[PDB]
Ligand binder design. Structure first.
Ligand code: TI5
Ligand code: CL
Length: 153
């Protein structure tokens, strides 16, 4: 179909699912592939090759469920995999109060041009990684403008 419609639907799906999980302190880790490949990391997860929806993203990350423990990787117009491994950053600049999801999101951002979104299960804050930088606890307006700029081409 039309690319721009899928991209805006992707953005709305992330905004809606992360708002839902943030409110309930459900951790999440969602990495959006771009030009650089996430293919090897997709292979580490459970293959879904599913249509993107906020409902599916929420169901994946329910705690103590088969699909929740690891990253979701979106590729093109599909949720490609759940429970994928991402490389963990060894950076000592990452705050010690952040968890493995953040360290994983930082690590993939150091070696891909992917955009990765984290929901902390400790605080509910939403964070974002790109190019080896972390944007910690962004507002809904900040998240919206970042995703517009980064995911709509
Ligand atoms: C430990 C871990 C958790 N989630 C994603 N990647 C990882 N390496
Ligand atoms: Cl967390």
């Amino acid at each position: 179909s039309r690319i721009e419609r899928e991209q805006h639907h992707l953005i709305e799906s992330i905004e809606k699912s992360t708002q839902y999980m943030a409110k309930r302190r459900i951790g999440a880790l969602i990495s959006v592939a771009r030009d650089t490949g996430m293919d090897d990391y997709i292979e580490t997860g459970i293959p879904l090759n599913a249509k993107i929806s906020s409902q599916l993203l929420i169901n994946i990350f329910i705690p103590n469920t088969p699909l929740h423990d690891g990253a979701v990787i979106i590729k093109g117009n599909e949720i490609a995999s759940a429970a994928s491994y991402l490389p963990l950053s060894d950076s000592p600049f990452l705050s010690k109060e952040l968890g493995t999801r953040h360290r994983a999101a930082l690590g993939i951002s150091e070696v891909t041009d992917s955009i990765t979104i984290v929901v902390s299960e400790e605080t509910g804050g939403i964070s974002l990684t790109k190019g080896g930088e972390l944007f910690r606890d962004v507002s809904e307006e900040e998240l919206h403008k970042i995703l517009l700029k980064e995911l709509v081409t």
